[PDB]
Design an enzyme around this catalytic site. Structure first.
Site, PDB file in Angstrom:
ATOM      1  N   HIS A  50      -5.671  -1.906  -6.741  1.00 23.20           N
ATOM      2  CA  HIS A  50      -5.485  -0.463  -6.489  1.00 23.20           C
ATOM      3  C   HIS A  50      -4.219   0.106  -7.078  1.00 23.20           C
ATOM      4  O   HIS A  50      -3.308  -0.595  -7.433  1.00 23.20           O
ATOM      5  CB  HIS A  50      -5.578  -0.154  -5.004  1.00 23.20           C
ATOM      6  CG  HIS A  50      -4.436  -0.735  -4.174  1.00 23.20           C
ATOM      7  ND1 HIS A  50      -3.221  -0.115  -4.047  1.00 23.20           N
ATOM      8  CD2 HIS A  50      -4.348  -1.869  -3.442  1.00 23.20           C
ATOM      9  CE1 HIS A  50      -2.420  -0.846  -3.286  1.00 23.20           C
ATOM     10  NE2 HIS A  50      -3.077  -1.926  -2.918  1.00 23.20           N
ATOM     11  N   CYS A  98      -3.258  -7.482  -1.716  1.00 24.08           N
ATOM     12  CA  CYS A  98      -3.883  -6.734  -2.782  1.00 24.08           C
ATOM     13  C   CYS A  98      -3.130  -6.880  -4.080  1.00 24.08           C
ATOM     14  O   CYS A  98      -1.948  -7.181  -4.113  1.00 24.08           O
ATOM     15  CB  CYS A  98      -3.936  -5.255  -2.370  1.00 24.08           C
ATOM     16  SG  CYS A  98      -5.153  -5.000  -1.060  1.00 24.08           S
TER      17      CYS A  98
END
Length: 259
Positions: free
Chosen positions: A187, A205
Site C-alpha cells: 500500500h 505490510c
C-alpha cells in the site's frame, strides 16, 4: 443436506500465474474424496495438478509450478446430485473457464529493501519498500495477489485483535493490494517514504510510495505473485487463503482428502 459449490476465478477471467482453482462449498464436506472425484479440471497446454483442502469447505487445485502464461483452464464441478458424505448432496454443477495472463512476479528483498516487479522476466519497476519492523516482521514466502482497494481502513479488530493492544493497529491507506487473507497488503505510505529502502517501519505490510502503490494497484492482478525474502520473520502459512505455494508440491500432491 444440500450444498452449493462456488468456483473462483470467475468465468472469463484472466488471472496471474499463481492463481489456484478454488471450489468453495457452503457446508462442510464430509467426504473430501467424493468432492475431488466430481471436479474435473482441463488444461491447455496440459499440466499435472492436484487438490488440497484449505479447510472443510474449500479445496484448491494447482500445478507443481506457477502456471504457464496463456494457459486455458476449464473447471467442471459436476456435483449436482452427488453424495458428498453424510447424506449431503450437491445442489448444482458449476462450469468455469479462465485464462492465465502475463507472468508478474514481484520480489521484496529485506537485504536490499527493494520490491522489484518483473513482467515475463523483465524488470519493469524497482520500488523502495519499508516492511514489518523487527517486532512485527513480514513473513517470508510466496503470496498470491488478491483483491485491490482504492482506499481501505486496515483495522486489526477485523481479525479479532483490539486496536489498543500489543498486536493492534488502525490505519487509513490508499492504493492497497491484498496479498494475504491474514491482512498483509502492498500500500501507499507517504509518511514512510524516507524509510523506504532503508528501514522497516510497518506492522507487516509492504509500504511503498504513493505513485508506486498506485502503479501496483493498476498493473498487478488477482493471481500475480509477491515473494518476500530475507526478512527476520517466519513463513506465510500454506493455508492462509493466499499462501498455497508455501506448501511443497510433494505434500500438496499427496493431498489431505483423508484428513
Amino acid at each position: 443436506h444440500l450444498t452449493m459449490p462456488y468456483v473462483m476465478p470467475g468465468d472469463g477471467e484472466v488471472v496471474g500465474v499463481g492463481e489456484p482453482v478454488a471450489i468453495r462449498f457452503d457446508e462442510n464436506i464430509a467426504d473430501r474424496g467424493a468432492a475431488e472425484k466430481a471436479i474435473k479440471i482441463t488444461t491447455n497446454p496440459p499440466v499435472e495438478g492436484a487438490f488440497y483442502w484449505l479447510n472443510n469447505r474449500e479445496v484448491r487445485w494447482r500445478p507443481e509450478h506457477f502456471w504457464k502464461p496463456g494457459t486455458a483452464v476449464d473447471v467442471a464441478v459436476n456435483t449436482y446430485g452427488v453424495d458428498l458424505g453424510e447424506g449431503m448432496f450437491g445442489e448444482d454443477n458449476v462450469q468455469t473457464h479462465f485464462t492465465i495472463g502475463d507472468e508478474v512476479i514481484a520480489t521484496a528483498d529485506d537485504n536490499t529493501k527493494i520490491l522489484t516487479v518483473r513482467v515475463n522476466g523483465e524488470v519493469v519497476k524497482s520500488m523502495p519498500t519499508s516492511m514489518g519492523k523487527d517486532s512485527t516482521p513480514t513473513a517470508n514466502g510466496i503470496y498470491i495477489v488478491g483483491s485491490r482497494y482504492k482506499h481501505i481502513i486496515m483495522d486489526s479488530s477485523t481479525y479479532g485483535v483490539p486496536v489498543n493492544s500489543p498486536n493492534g493497529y488502525r490505519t487509513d491507506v490508499d492504493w492497497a493490494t491484498q496479498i494475504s487473507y491474514s491482512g498483509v497488503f502492498v500500500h501507499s505510505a507517504p509518511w514512510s517514504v524516507g524509510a523506504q529502502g532503508h528501514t522497516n517501519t510497518s506492522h507487516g505490510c509492504l509500504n511503498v510510495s504513493p505513485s508506486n502503490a498506485q502503479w501496483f494497484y493498476d498493473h498487478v492482478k488477482r493471481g500475480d505473485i509477491v515473494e518476500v525474502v530475507n526478512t527476520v520473520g517466519g513463513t506465510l502459512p500454506g493455508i492462509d487463503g493466499l499462501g498455497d505455494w508455501n506448501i511443497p508440491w510433494d505434500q500438496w500432491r499427496a493431498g489431505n482428502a483423508k484428513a
